Amino acid sequence: MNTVPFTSAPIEVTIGIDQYSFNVKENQPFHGIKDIPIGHVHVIHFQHADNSSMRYGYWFDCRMGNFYIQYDPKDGLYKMMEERDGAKFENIVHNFKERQMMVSYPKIDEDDTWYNLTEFVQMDKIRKIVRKDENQFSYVDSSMTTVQENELSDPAHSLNYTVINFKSREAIRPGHEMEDFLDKSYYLNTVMLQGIFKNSSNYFGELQFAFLNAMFFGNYGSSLQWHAMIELICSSATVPKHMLDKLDEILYYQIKTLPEQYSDILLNERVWNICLYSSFQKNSLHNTEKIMENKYPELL
Amino acid sequence: GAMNSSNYAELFNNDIKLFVDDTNVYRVTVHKTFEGNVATKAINGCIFTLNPKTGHLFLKIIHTSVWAGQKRLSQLAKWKTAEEVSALVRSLPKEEQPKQIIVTRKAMLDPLEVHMLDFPNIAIRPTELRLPFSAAMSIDKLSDVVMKATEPQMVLFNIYDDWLDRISSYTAFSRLTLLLRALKTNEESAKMILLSDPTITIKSYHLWPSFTDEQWITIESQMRDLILTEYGRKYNV
């Protein structure tokens, strides 16, 4: 069970840790988050009370180093940093714990929600989508654009999601125009799975990461990527049986976790109606179709 | 974006463009079977690909053999149209290739865009105009070459005959659209108007009769009268 200490909390802020969130008051004696489960990526995220604009946050994995948060009054945000001195860090955490200045990661023993949302998500893949190689952790915010959004403008601050475009030479073999457009199995299985992702686990990891950036930061380009990766599977007549069964589980937990009040902006009517009711896989996502019909029958 | 009444002069500028109409590609007669079910029998069709500035018509005849053993023919028809338009563009010298292709029906947009991925600088556009190119098979000489075809064939016409010697492209297109709108609304009456006087003939190398400038005004007037009558009936107004 690992710890992310905070130097201080000089500005009033809502702090998220995965699917949980806590309000901290200006200059409240808050010194961090303890009992963070080992074995998963985590995201620690922030929304300032005085500017509900720019949700921002940090993806990290406590197995990769000792990380803490410190407010920067110049750049006006909570920053993640690595402490390289193991003994200084252990001594900081033990003191803050002794003074009970830390909130406990509030996991219910029964509750597999975070595992279910991050099953395929790996820190090493996050660090290739979010390029800042001198840090072991990854910054994301509401405003960062994707490589695909930038093609259609600062490359260093981009989300380098895999570009998916149904009307592209990559998607459409010369001589198989109609076949490849109406059945994307070639594009899914040869170009994306065998070619780029290497396996379905890396594909699911990117899909799950795109969803979590859409949900936690309202990142519009992440939402586009999540829907494109769903639509590429649902629009393929030929998908391995294990991939369809896993996709149904992935999407079920994503729809279950989504705030009820955000379904209007985070869910694309066209993609979901097409995926559940028209596509090749219309009958392959039983769990997802049932939660969508009971939670968001308006969208459909 | 979409071609409409606001950007109509763009048709007659010096940027090569083609209209593509796919409404006569897949043609059927619906009939009863011996068992009293319904079946279709395909007949020969055509892609209507027209340069509105020059009058050059690329009539690609679609022989019924292309449908043999295929499913979802109304869907395939859009993709076959896009395949043949793409083949036509690649067959043209670079300086003759269009800068824009305008499809008369929005369902042609995705099929043509995917077939033309190799031509990213050719714009594929819809139109808000309701163009009467479905009536192309009311032109006797175009109907005759489609129905007689025994294999896939491309036939080149000038749909304006020699009109551009006397009138602008704008006026030639307006005359063509009026003739086709008349033929589409009341084919029998339109064809009566065009041939009633036996002294005015169709040259062997033409589609329409050899009207003088004065006779075209009379004809055009008779076509407008035909269209308004039919309209009063359609709507009871």
From Swiss-Prot, chain A:
Broad class of the protein's primary localization: cytoplasm
Role this protein plays: Component of the U5 snRNP complex that is required for spliceosome assembly and for pre-mRNA splicing. Involved in splicing pre-mRNA of the A1 cistron and other genes that are important for cell growth.
PANTHER family reported in the protein's UniProt record: A1 CISTRON SPLICING FACTOR AAR2-RELATED, PROTEIN AAR2 HOMOLOG
Compartments (UniProt record): Cytoplasm; Nucleus
An example Gene Ontology biological process: spliceosomal snRNP assembly
Other remarks on this protein: Present with 7330 molecules/cell in log phase SD medium.
Gene: AAR2
Leucine-zipper: annotated span: 244-265
Designated name of the protein: A1 cistron-splicing factor AAR2
Residue numbers of Phosphoserine PTMs: S236
Effect of S236 to D/E: Disrupts interaction with PRP8
Disulfides per UniProt: none
CC per GO annotation: cytoplasm; U5 snRNP
Signal sequence coordinates: none
Subunit composition and interactions: Heterodimer. Interacts with PRP8 (via RNase H homology domain and MPN domain), competing with BRR2 for the same binding site. Component of a U5 snRNP complex that contains at least the U5 snRNA, PRP8, SNU114, AAR2, SMB1, SMD1, SMD2, SMD3, SME1, SMX2 and SMX3, but is not a component of the U4/U6-U5 tri-snRNP complex.
Post-translational modification comment from the UniProt entry: Phosphorylated on serine and tyrosine residues.
Keywords: Cytoplasm, mRNA processing, mRNA splicing, Nucleus, Phosphoprotein
Protein family membership: Belongs to the AAR2 family.
Chain positions with Phosphothreonine modification: T257
Curated annotation (Swiss-Prot), chain B:
Record region (RNase H homology domain): 7-237
Impact when changing D21A: Alters protein folding. Severely impaired growth. Strongly reduced growth at 35 degrees Celsius
Subcellular location: Nucleus
Outcome of swapping R105K: Severely impaired growth. Reduced growth at 30 degrees Celsius. Strongly reduced growth at 16 degrees Celsius
Effect of D21N: Reduced growth at 30 degrees Celsius. Strongly reduced growth at 16 degrees Celsius
Domain observations: The MPN (JAB/Mov34) domain has structural similarity with deubiquitinating enzymes, but lacks the residues that would bind the catalytic metal ion.
Additional remarks: Present with 468 molecules/cell in log phase SD medium.
Function text: Functions as a scaffold that mediates the ordered assembly of spliceosomal proteins and snRNAs. Required for association of BRR2 with the spliceosomal U5 snRNP, and the subsequent assembly of the U4/U6-U5 tri-snRNP complex. Functions as a scaffold that positions spliceosomal U2, U5 and U6 snRNAs at splice sites on pre-mRNA substrates, so that splicing can occur. Interacts with both the 5' and the 3' splice site, as well as the branch region. Has a role in branch site-3' splice site selection. Associates with the branch site-3' splice 3'-exon region. Also has a role in cell cycle.
Name this protein carries in UniProt: Pre-mRNA-splicing factor 8
Residues of the full protein shown: 1836 to 2069 of 2413
